[PDB]
From a paper:
The eukaryotic chaperonin TRiC/CCT assists the folding of about 10% of cytosolic proteins through an ATP-driven conformational cycle, and the essential cytoskeleton protein tubulin is the obligate substrate of TRiC. It has a double-ring structure, and each ring consists of eight paralogous subunits (denoted as CCT1–CCT8) arranged in a specific order. Here, we present an ensemble of cryo-EM structures of endogenous human TRiC throughout its ATPase cycle, with three of them revealing endogenously engaged tubulin in different folding stages.
In the current work, our control experiment of cryo-EM analysis on human TRiC incubated for 30 s with 1 mM ATP, a physiological concentration of ATP in the cell, further revealed the ability of human TRiC to close both rings, with a non-negligible population (27.2%) of such closed TRiC being detected.
Author numbering:
A (entry chain e): 18 to 135
B (entry chain g): 15 to 526
C (entry chain q): 7 to 529
D (entry chain h): 6 to 99
E (entry chain z): 6 to 526
Write the structure that this text describes.
């Protein structure tokens, strides 16, 4: 039920919209990568203020409605049990693979074929 | 909000003229009908000029004064009301001398007041006396209201009903010959029978119902006791009710209640009367002593109704039942009949004596006929009242208005000044009465009205009126349109006074 | 405000003026109703997708079902619908006949009224030609039933009635309905459609269906009692549970000790209630609601058979058969309200336990046709085909006369009436010739549903009927426009089926022509 | 004033059959790319907010619940495909 | 020139509004005149469909939107209450009088002169009707022609002959020796599940509630009728007492004590049966209106009594006069003097309920006309046709004079008015000329509904002239002039007499309305 007012995104534009939503998270954390990376301002729902450059802490405090953006956050729980430091470097690397994949979709290459190349 | 300046007097004319323009065709036996749309979609086709203006909502204040004065006229005389508004609207219908000529109102008002005294003196010259001893001459006079009605078959009976009733109420010893229909002439209706069975009862009939089966059904010499106070246990000066929460005290209050009621009822039956008539109500404990004496219990009788009984059977009004003397008796009453007539309880105190009052009994087959016979005899009694006050008749059918219009024209030649112009306008304003009679018939208005003025110039003004049914010219000595003088005098005095009252108001101000 | 509305004096009811021709727009309403059911006529009729008022998806080609689901709000269109309700009386077929034929009369009546003929002459023209149709119809009777009560003959007649309703099952449903009908026929005048009750069961397919005697219910026996001859049957719609009085009866449960007391009390309440049933001598109890677990123990304790029927209509069938009413309270001991049955036992057919209510001593017309199907939508339509098949032989309980089907009589009867209209002078010949052309609507609607050109079929039918060859109807094929003999094919209709159908459809079109204006009124 | 349907939506003929054909292609379009072991997946979120990810054709058709009457027919055929076989619902629908 | 929140028409346009209202109403009701006319549909809005040609029903029941046309609807109500027929021809004449007068009013003629022409023409047409009526004695052959003429208009010309013998026979039985006739002596009943052609006579009265018991006799040849208002069901204590009980069982024991008063009265019914005609070939019937206890039904059923209960007021009223049983309010006064007599009493079983037939009576002074039909609205249409047929025969027997129909009288009156010179006013002849052409609308409308030409039909019937009396009328089937007296077409005298009085008064008052004012609207 509830077929009316159902948000649907399909076609080739659906992939380019998912990449754009993923690049929004990667472009945010790429400035905080490294020891000289700039910090981020956090305003809690209760009014608290904290400042940290830690990437794993940022992803936990970011509230994103988009579904693909939520998948990027779930990756932090898996990496923190291993590295816990360069977690930002994985999000930046994930955003670079999708950004260069946008140029390949214009050439007509199938997405599964692109994933096999990586 | 408010109006000031010449607009008030110019507005009062259009307000009075609009109300008059409706009923212009309601005058005469051939008068046209009208149609009223109810808010729910109903239609009322009545041609009565009194009912039309009663249901019409009028916004302007002067339009209300036109209706309120006409309603007062209906109380005194039930005829000629439509002619009052037509004349009151025609005298104000000429605005030339009011505004365009720039004449001051008091100059015009002085012209109407001088013309009013001339219209009165002219009617007394052309009038004719009447012999009130002959009932045949009174027959054709009353037939003016009886014509075009369903009582035309019983018309011969309808004349004797209104004639003998008013002659009883008339008291000529005082010198003013005062007659009051609303009290002494009081009428009630009797279900059952036909129109022929309707007669004139000599006495005062009471509609009080029979509460208990024990009463006097028929008496040869009734006895009536009149007292104002009600029969009840004596209370205090206030209306506070008696509340008793104890049983021992209930026996003390009940004993006082039974003692005083039995004491007053004992002095009433000491004279052994046939009935007890009280002004106020009667309780249940008092009726137990009335049914034991086998006498009729009558209550709720007003002061005027009791004053007529005292002069009939020779009764006397006493304040309290304990003070009743032997002077209060019903000796001289013809009969006492409580018998049911037409499935309703009636009481007949009727006798052989004339206590300046009577009672009209309306027989009929249905309530629809009773309502028709009632209203037809009401104005007929007022016709009898107007004739007995001033036994003089004037020619109708428009001959009276034209006879006065000829006298005003001839006298205006000797009048010198600016008042002669509005003084002549009254003579032409009286021509509206014969004009509507011809227009309703269908004949040409200009041709007949012009030849009518030539008749009053040469021949006598007492004759040569206008026939309403045929439309031609006929003398009023050969036709029964002769009308009482008291009606025409009251009509002209009201039409002029109303026209003057509206000209005197130059401003309308809202405030309290 | 002038100018005012044309012809409307009453309650704002739309009144068509002279140039508006109120008669035609009333015909237009009845014309659209025929177009909906015109494509459902014949064995090739298209299925209709119907949404029930309960938002259930139903697919059926039955015309009577469409008129129930589709609400007809037009007054003049209700007259044809009400004529269809009278069509279901005295015969169980001919519903599609009235809807198509009554519309055919009104479509051709529009052509006559445009010529300027009076509406009164059109009315008199149909009533005269209708009497000629009732005289010719007996002469068109070819063969009649042998009245042998043989399954081969009984199943051979159902081939036509089952056709146009359930296709492809014509062979199977012919013998199944025949076995149930041949049981009652030995009883003279006792045959009734209400005596044969149909009970549908979810299963593999129609091939698994069978025929049984008595009243067969799909619900098994809750008790362990196999067979009992007890005639006392008490139907109880109240479910079995703890007995509660109609008074207050407040039960206060505080501690676990009292919880076990009132728990055992319900076992004692159900004990005395079932005991009162065995005291009256009733070993058969029908339950409309659920059944408690403890009630199954007392049922076998007193050896009382228990029947659990969840359907409400299944309970009303017992109330009008054995006469056992369903009381609101829990097992009232009333003998007067019970029923009577000669034989009661549990049976198994198709790997399913079924309960059988029949009369061994008394003959009875009671019989039950068990149906099986995968889809309830397709299985319910089979029940509609059975009622039309059983009602077909309810007419043959009267005089047995058969007429050819497949539009064979429609061409033969239209050819004879045309001859009488030509010999009859005056202005009545116009309405008679149009009455004969109204018969052409059936073979056209039958050919269009089969994918065959209509004008080609009508041309061939007049050629073979002109030479004197009767019994020639329309052959049903997609690629073959030609025709074949109906008598050898086994397609035969009912005499009284056509007789009452022509009479009712005639008066339905006449009444519409009599009403020239529709006016709304207020109470 | 007097109307037969009174808000009743009904249509027949050729346009009604063509409208049903276009509705059946929409149902087959969703499970179209999910055919095969290497086929792409789908993401469906319910009212609770959780996302379901899989290429299974039987699971996707259950979550769609299309209100179109002709679309419900193809959905019901997939349910009968599970009882008889248990796979191939994507192939039958497509 | 008017007050706010109202409207007034000062000029003659107020008269033109009323004329347009009559012309609009004339065109609506002109199509239902005659048997060849069409029918109007009555939709109550709740789904009830009613079909009738009666003018009184199409007016009184249907509310008209236009205010002026509603007054004419109230006139047809008083029109049907007197004669019972002619409501359709009443409106058609009023519409034509206002139409023909509009030609002269537009020329400047005052309406009062036209109204005087109607009064002079009404007296001339009324005196001419005196010579037209026929004084012949009413017999069975004439009443059939009067019945067929009245019924043929309200039916399909099918049930006519079926309803013809039912209406004529019901009137002849209730009137003997010039006795005043009352239509309340005839009862109308309706049954379902039967064809419309099954309507027949009922000599007795049809009762609603029958007898309930397996042993009730389906038919009883002879029996006596005992009228009772007493209820035999459970009743409280008749004497002075109260409810004294120590349990629920003791309260039921007082029930048998209270029932003893009724049970002893039930035995009195059995005693009276055996005392008066309690032998074989006899019976007894209980017509008691109130309810009867089922146990009392069993005691009376074993004796051969057919019990009745839960009756109505109109039923017991007719059973009192027909059977002769005196109303008995207490069984202590039970005596054989209150017993009546009745013939064969049987209950005909329908497809649903059962009704009781008291028939085969000597002189019950009551009968019943049973109507049968497939639907509800068909029963209503037939019931209206019966009462319209009864008043047609009643007026024909009461007034021994009948007049020819088929528009023969209206054409004959139009000729005498044209040859009549004005007896009152010279200009009053324009009203006579307008009233003369208005009487010709009756044969014109009959030509339209028959499908013929309006002009050709009127010229032929007017061209008929001879030395002796010749009365011709419009023939619907042929179209040629036809004598209505020879073919058995007759109308009542009071109907034609009332139309001249009603059409003159109503059309006059419409021309007498000078202005239309809004009061409170």
């Amino acid at each position: 039920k509830d077929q009316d007012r159902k948000s649907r995104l399909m076609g080739l534009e659906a992939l380019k919209s998912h990449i754009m939503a993923a690049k929004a998270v990667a472009n945010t954390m790429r400035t905080s990568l490294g020891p000289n990376g700039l910090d981020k301002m956090m305003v809690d729902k209760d009014g608290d203020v904290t400042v940290t450059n830690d990437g794993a802490t940022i992803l936990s405090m970011m509230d994103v409605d988009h579904q693909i953006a939520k998948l990027m956050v779930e990756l932090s729980k898996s990496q923190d049990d291993e590295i816990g430091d360069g977690t930002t470097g994985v999000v930046v690397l994930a955003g670079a693979l999708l950004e260069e994949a946008e140029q390949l979709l214009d050439r007509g290459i199938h997405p599964i074929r692109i994933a096999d190349g990586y | 909000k408010r109006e000031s300046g010449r607009k008030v007097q110019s507005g009062n004319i259009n307000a009075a003229k609009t109300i008059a323009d409706i009923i212009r065709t309601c005058l005469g036996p051939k008068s046209m009908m009208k149609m009223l749309l109810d808010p729910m979609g109903g239609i009322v086709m009545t041609n009565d000029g009194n009912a039309i203006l009663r249901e019409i909502q009028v916004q302007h204040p002067a339009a209300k004064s036109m209706i309120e004065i006409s309603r007062t006229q209906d109380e005194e005389v039930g005829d000629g009301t439509t002619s009052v508004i037509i004349l009151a609207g025609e005298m104000l219908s000429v605005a030339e001398h009011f505004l365009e000529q720039q004449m001051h109102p008091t100059v015009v008002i002085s012209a109407y007041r001088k013309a009013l005294d001339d219209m009165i003196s002219t009617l007394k010259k052309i009038s004719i006396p009447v012999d009130i001893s002959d009932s045949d001459m009174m027959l054709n006079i009353i037939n003016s209201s009886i014509t075009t009605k369903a009582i035309s078959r019983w018309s011969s009976l309808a004349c004797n009903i209104a004639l003998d009733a008013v002659k009883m109420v008339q008291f000529e010893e005082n010198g003013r010959k005062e007659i009051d229909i609303k009290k002494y002439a009081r009428v009630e209706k009797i279900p059952g029978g036909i129109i022929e069975d309707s007669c004139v009862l000599r006495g005062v009939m009471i509609n009080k119902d029979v509460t208990h089966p024990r009463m006097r059904r028929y008496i040869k010499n009734p006895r009536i006791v009149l007292l104002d106070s009600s029969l009840e246990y004596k209370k205090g000066e206030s209306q506070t009710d008696i509340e008793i929460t104890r049983e021992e005290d209930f026996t003390r209050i009940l004993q006082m209640e039974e003692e005083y009621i039995q004491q007053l009822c004992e002095d009433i039956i000491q004279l052994k009367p046939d009935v007890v008539i009280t002004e106020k109500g009667i309780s249940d404990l008092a009726q137990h002593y009335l049914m034991r004496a086998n006498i009729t219990a009558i209550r709720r009788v007003r002061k005027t109704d009791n004053n007529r009984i005292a002069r009939a059977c020779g009764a006397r009004i006493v304040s309290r039942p304990e003070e009743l003397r032997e002077d209060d008796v019903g000796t001289g009453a013809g009969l006492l009949e409580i018998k049911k007539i037409g499935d309703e309880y009636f009481t007949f105190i009727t006798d052989c004596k004339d206590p300046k009052a009577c009672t009209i009994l309306l027989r009929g087959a249905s309530k629809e006929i009773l309502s028709e016979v009632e209203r037809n005899l009401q104005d007929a009694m007022q016709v009898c009242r107007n004739v007995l006050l001033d036994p003089q008749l004037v020619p109708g059918g428009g001959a009276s208005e034209m006879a006065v219009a000829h006298a005003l024209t001839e006298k205006s030649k000797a009048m010198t000044g600016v008042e002669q112009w509005p003084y002549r306008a009254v003579a032409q304003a009286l021509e509206v009465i014969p004009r509507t009679l011809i227009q309703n018939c269908g004949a040409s208005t200009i041709r007949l009205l012009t030849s009518l003025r030539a008749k009053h110039t040469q021949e006598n003004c007492e004759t040569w009126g206008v026939n309403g049914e045929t439309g031609t010219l006929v003398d009023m000595k050969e036709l029964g349109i002769w009308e009482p003088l008291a009606v025409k005098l009251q009509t002209y005095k009201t039409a002029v006074e109303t026209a003057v009252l509206l000209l005197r108001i130059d401003d309308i101000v809202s405030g309290h | 405000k002038a100018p005012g509305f044309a012809q409307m004096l009453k309650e704002g009811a739309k009144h068509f003026s002279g140039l508006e021709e109120a008669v035609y727009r009333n015909i237009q309403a009845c014309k659209e109703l025929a177009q909906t059911t015109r494509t459902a006529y014949g064995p090739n009729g298209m299925n209709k997708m119907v949404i029930n008022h309960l938002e259930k998806l139903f697919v059926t080609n039955d015309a009577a079902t469409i008129l129930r689901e589709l609400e007809v709000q037009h007054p003049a269109a209700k007259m044809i619908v009400m004529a269809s309700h009278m069509q279901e009386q005295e015969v169980g077929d001919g519903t599609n006949f009235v809807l198509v034929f009554a519309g055919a009369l009104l479509e051709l009546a529009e052509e006559l009224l445009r010529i300027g003929l009076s509406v009164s002459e059109v009315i008199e023209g149909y009533e005269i030609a209708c009497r000629k149709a009732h005289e010719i119809l007996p002469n068109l009777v070819c063969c009649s039933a042998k009245n042998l009560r043989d399954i081969d003959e009984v199943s051979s007649l159902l081939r036509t009635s089952i056709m146009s309703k359930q296709y492809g099952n014509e062979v199977f449903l012919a013998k199944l309905i025949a076995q149930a009908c041949v049981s009652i026929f030995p009883d003279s005048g006792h045959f009734n459609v209400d005596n044969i009750r149909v009970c549908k069961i979810l299963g593999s397919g129609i091939s698994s269906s069978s025929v049984l005697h008595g009243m067969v219910f799909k619900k098994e026996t809750e008790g362990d009692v196999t067979s009992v001859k007890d005639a006392k049957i008490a139907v109880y719609s109240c479910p079995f549970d703890g007995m509660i009085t109609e008074t207050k009866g407040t039960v206060l449960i505080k501690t676990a000790e009292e919880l076990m007391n009132f728990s055992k009390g319900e076992e004692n309440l159900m004990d005395a209630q079932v005991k009162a049933i065995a005291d009256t001598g009733a070993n058969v109890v029908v339950t409309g609601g659920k059944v408690a677990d403890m009630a199954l123990h007392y049922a076998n304790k007193y050896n009382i058979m228990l029947v659990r029927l969840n359907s409400k209509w299944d309970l009303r069938r017992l109330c009008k058969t054995v006469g056992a009413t369903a009381l609101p309270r829990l097992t009232p001991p009333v003998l007067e309200e019970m029923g009577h049955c000669d034989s009661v036992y549990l049976s198994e057919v198709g790997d399913t336990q079924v309960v059988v209510f029949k009369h061994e001593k008394e003959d009875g017309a009671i019989s039950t046709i068990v149906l099986r199907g995968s889809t309830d939508n397709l299985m319910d339509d089979i029940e509609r085909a059975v009622d039309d098949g059983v009602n077909t032989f309810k007419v043959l309980t009267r005089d047995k006369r058969l007429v050819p089907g497949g539009g064979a009589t429609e061409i033969e009867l239209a050819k004879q009436i045309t001859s009488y209209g030509e010999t009859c002078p005056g202005l009545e010949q116009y309405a008679i010739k149009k009455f004969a052309e109204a018969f052409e609507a059936i073979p056209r609607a039958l050919a269009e549903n089969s994918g065959v050109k209509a004008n080609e079929v009508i041309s061939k039918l007049y050629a073979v009927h002109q030479e004197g060859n009767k019994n020639v109807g329309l052959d049903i094929e997609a690629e073959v426009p030609a025709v074949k003999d109906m008598l050898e094919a086994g397609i035969l209709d009912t005499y009284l089926g056509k007789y009452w159908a022509i009479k009712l459809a005639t008066n339905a079109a006449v009444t519409v022509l009599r009403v020239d204006q529709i006016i709304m009124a207020k109470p | 004033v007097i109307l037969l349907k009174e808000g009743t939506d009904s249509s027949q003929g050729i346009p009604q059959l063509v409208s049903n054909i276009s509705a059946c292609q929409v149902i087959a379009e969703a499970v179209r790319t999910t055919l095969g072991p290497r086929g792409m997946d789908k993401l469906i979120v319910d009212g609770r907010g959780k996302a379901t990810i899989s290429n299974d054709g039987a699971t996707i058709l259950k979550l769609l619940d299309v209100v179109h009457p002709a679309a419900k027919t193809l959905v019901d055929i997939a349910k009968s495909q599970d009882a008889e076989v248990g796979d191939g619902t994507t192939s039958v629908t497509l | 020139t008017l007050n706010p929140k109202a409207e007034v028409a000062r000029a003659q346009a107020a008269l033109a509004v009323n004329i347009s209202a009559a012309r609009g109403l004339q065109d609506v009701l002109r199509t239902n005149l005659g048997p060849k006319g069409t029918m109007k549909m009555l939709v109550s809005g709740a789904g009830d469909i009613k079909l009738t040609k009666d003018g009184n029903v199409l007016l009184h029941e249907m509310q008209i939107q236009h205010p002026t046309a509603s007054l004419i609807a109230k006139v047809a109500t008083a029109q049907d209450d007197i004669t019972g027929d002619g409501t359709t021809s009443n409106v058609l004449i009023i519409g034509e009088l206002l139409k023909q007068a509009d030609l002269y009013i537009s020329e400047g003629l005052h309406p009062r002169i036209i109204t005087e022409g109607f009064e002079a023409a009404k007296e001339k047409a009324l005196q001419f009707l005196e010579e037209v009526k026929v004084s012949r004695e009413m017999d069975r052959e004439t009443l059939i022609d009067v019945a067929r003429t009245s019924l043929r208009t309200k039916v399909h010309a099918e049930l006519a002959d079926v309803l013809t013998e039912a209406v004529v026979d019901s009137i002849l039985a209730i009137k003997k020796q010039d006795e005043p006739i009352d239509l309340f002596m005839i009862e109308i009943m309706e049954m379902k599940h039967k064809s419309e052609t099954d309507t027949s006579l009922i000599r007795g009265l049809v009762l609603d509630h029958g007898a309930r018991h397996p042993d009730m006799k389906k038919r009883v040849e002879d029996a006596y009728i005992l009228t009772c208002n007493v209820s035999l069901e459970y009743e409280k204590t008749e004497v002075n007492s109260g409810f004294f009980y120590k349990s629920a069982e003791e309260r039921e024991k007082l029930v048998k004590a209270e029932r003893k008063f009724i049970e002893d009265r039930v035995k009195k019914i059995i005693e009276l049966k055996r005392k008066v005609c309690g032998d074989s070939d006899k019976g007894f019937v209980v017509i008691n209106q109130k309810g009867i206890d089922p146990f009392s039904l069993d005691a009376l059923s074993k004796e051969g009594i057919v019990a009745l209960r839960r009756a109505k007021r109109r039923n017991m009223e007719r059973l009192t006069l027909a059977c002769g049983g005196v109303a008995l309010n207490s069984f202590d006064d039970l005596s054989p003097d209150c017993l009546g007599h009745a013939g064969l009493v049987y209950e005909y079983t329908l497809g649903e309920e059962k009704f009781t037939f008291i028939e085969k009576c000597n002189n019950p002074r009551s009968v019943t006309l049973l109507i049968k039909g497939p639907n509800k609205h068909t029963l209503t249409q037939i019931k209206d046709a019966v009462r319209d047929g009864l008043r047609a025969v009643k007026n024909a027997i009461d007034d021994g004079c009948v007049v020819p129909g088929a528009g023969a009288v209206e054409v004959a009156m139009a000729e005498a008015l044209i040859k009549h010179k004005p007896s009152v006013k010279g200009r009053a002849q324009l009203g006579v000329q307008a009233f003369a052409d208005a009487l010709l609308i009756i044969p014109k409308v009959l030509a339209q509904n028959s499908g013929f030409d309006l002009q050709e039909t009127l010229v032929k019937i007017q061209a008929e002239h001879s030395e002796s009396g010749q009365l011709v009328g419009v023939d619907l089937n042929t179209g040629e002039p036809m004598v209505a007296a020879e073919v058995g077409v007759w109308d009542n005298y009071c109907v034609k007499k009332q139309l001249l009085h009603s059409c003159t008064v109503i059309a006059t008052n419409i021309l007498l309305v000078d202005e239309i004012m809004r009061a409170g609207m």
